[PDB]
Amino acid sequence: QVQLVQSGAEVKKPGASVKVSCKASGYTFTGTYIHWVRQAPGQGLEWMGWINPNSGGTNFAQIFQGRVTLTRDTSISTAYMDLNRLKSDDTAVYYCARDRVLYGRSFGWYFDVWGAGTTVTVSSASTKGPSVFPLAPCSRSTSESTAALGCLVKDYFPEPVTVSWNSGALTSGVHTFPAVLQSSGLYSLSSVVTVPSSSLGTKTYTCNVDHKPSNTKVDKRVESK
Amino acid sequence: ITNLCPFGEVFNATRFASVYAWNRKRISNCVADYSVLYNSASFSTFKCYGVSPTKLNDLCFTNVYADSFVIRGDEVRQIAPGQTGKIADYNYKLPDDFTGCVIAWNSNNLDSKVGGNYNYLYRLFRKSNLKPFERDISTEIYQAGSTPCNGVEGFNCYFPLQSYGFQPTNGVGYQPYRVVVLSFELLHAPATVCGPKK
Amino acid sequence: DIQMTQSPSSLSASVGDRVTITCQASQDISDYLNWYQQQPGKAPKLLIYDASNLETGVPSRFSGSGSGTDFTFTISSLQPEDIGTYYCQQYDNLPTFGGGTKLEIKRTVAAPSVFIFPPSDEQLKSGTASVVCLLNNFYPREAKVQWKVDNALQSGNSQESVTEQDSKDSTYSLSSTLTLSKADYEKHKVYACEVTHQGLSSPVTKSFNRGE
Ligand SMILES: *[C@@H]1O[C@H](CO[C@@H]2O[C@@H](C)[C@@H](O)[C@@H](O)[C@@H]2O)[C@@H](O[C@@H]2O[C@H](CO)[C@@H](O)[C@H](O)[C@H]2NC(C)=O)[C@H](O)[C@H]1NC(C)=O
């Protein structure tokens, strides 16, 4: 049971710094390098550097050299990555990953055991709760066969909003689209459902929206005009 | 006891120690099927200094230490007890009454790189030859000249460690060889590592 | 540096098809390459190391081959758990990754179900307006959306969010959102979106006027 456990989501202003941590267990922590690798939203992987937890020696990719600092507390098997003077495109998932204990070449880096990843968000925008608006086709009489309807969650910043329908009682034909980061720095996402035009008279549909950073749980009932 | 030895962690670990800084692992509270090692054609050398390698399965051992390091292929001759030369003199000495095994295999597809793998070092200099199973990590500047020296460098003063340049195109003998030395004691004390007799 | 390129930036493949993805290094890398799979919403997983050594416990279908500047990774017959991004990585000099190849399941063509959604009274009460054009259950990803008001083509004031491929039936869905001030919304009568797509015989227009 080898494992790497990281700190929860980090949220930061431009020009600040962030301290991601990586608690190792299930193997001898001094035995192999710990690499730090990052991944920007919808983009490829990028290696930042490593620490050798036995010697405390480190090496960095040139882009991060003078920005990243890697350290470790062997008494608690924890490696740390500190990233200084943060810019907006340092918004990324940050992973620690171990360098293969057996069967490799003595030079080679690899990344055989990976941590869960820590999302860092670097932006000017303050924490804000979503405003949730109903979406319905046009009018009730202009509907036909299978309808679609939804709710749009607008202008909220602390990333991870969760949307669910009728307290989770409805899941057939549900979508919740990936959020778009707007020009104001606040996020928005659309969530939508398909239903028979016949069921709108029997029942009503409620999207439930939970935004943990703002403690903002809000429910919108969606009705056809 | 029923759990097997950590011989996978000893023999197949991705990177070995430099010979100047040879790593030691203590083996205890486990079963040791030495027939799995000795029947393996991958070992270029498996020389035993107080037991036959066929008898290792019929024995139970007091404490067992595996010493792991990398050396040049022409230098594998120096790891036998009573041998001499810069590896036996300055970085890894076995005592003349050593009881145990020296096990060695070529690593040219593992430790050797097309630009040179300089990650592996040996001790080129030492005031006096080191004692049996001593290890010297210290990087104090060696003084071959008659004058004392200070700071990082000088005329006829030298950094004491040197790296080995392992390339996959090196002639055999300049290719890297991994060594494991197993250094057990026998039949005169309570025992914790056991050959697989029921 | 060593820059690395992967030849397919994405590759649609059927269940049971053979997949080949090629990675090229700018320098000669000998066999100092690893391959990793990233399934949607997880950390990467090492599959091949040292250009062709298959890792412990990974399926036998995965292969890696080649040496020098040009390398290949292969799936001998694709299975619906193989869907993700595949990245190559050199280790000759500081471990650089390639751009990644997305796999996706190949399917037969399918048309988008098109819906349009007017701004709610609660939204117009905030002093801002946004209108959503929804395309549901289609397969050839590349669907292009045109936004019009009074037959005039709009630009930059709209943005689109596309789902990951639906695991149940290998299909996409997206919506485009157009945004306007409360003053900009009211001054146009006709509001339309038009979808042009490989799964349609001709483009289709969905539209409405304020009120109804
Ligand atoms: C040291 O490793 C070798 C071979 O390395 C790997 O072993 C495989 C199980 C797999 O992890 C691959 O990546 C490599 O091939 C071990 O040799 C194997 O031993 C088993 C029996 O224990 C035998 O069935 C296999 O045929 C052997 N394979 C080869 C290629 O020789 C070896 O046992 C390991 N040493 C120790 C002390 O455990």
Residue numbers in the entry:
A (entry chain H): 1 to 52, 52A, 53 to 82, 82A, 82B, 82C, 83 to 100, 100A, ...
B (entry chain A): 332 to 529
C (entry chain L): 1 to 94, 96 to 213
According to the publication:
Binding of the SARS-CoV-2 spike protein to its obligate angiotensin-converting enzyme 2 (ACE2) receptor on the target cell surface initiates infection. The RBD can adopt two distinct conformations: “down” and “up”; the “down” state is shielded from ACE2 binding, while the “up” state is ACE2-accessible.
The interaction buried an 939 Å2 surface area on the antibody and an 936 Å2 area from the spike protein. In particular, part of the 17-residue HC CDR3 wedged into a short groove formed by two segments in the RBD encompassing residues 343-346 and 441-444, respectively, while the tip of the 343-346 segment (mainly Thr345 and Arg346) projected into a ring-like structure formed by the HC CDR3. The intertwined contacts between the HC CDR3 and the RBD accounted for 78% of the binding surface area contributed by the HC. There appeared to be an extensive hydrogen bond network between Asn343, Thr345, Arg346, Asn440, Leu441 from the RBD and Val97, Leu98, Tyr99, Gly100, Arg100A, Ser100B from the HC CDR3. Indeed, a surface plasmon resonance competition assay showed that SP-77 did not compete with ACE2 for binding to the RBD or spike trimer.
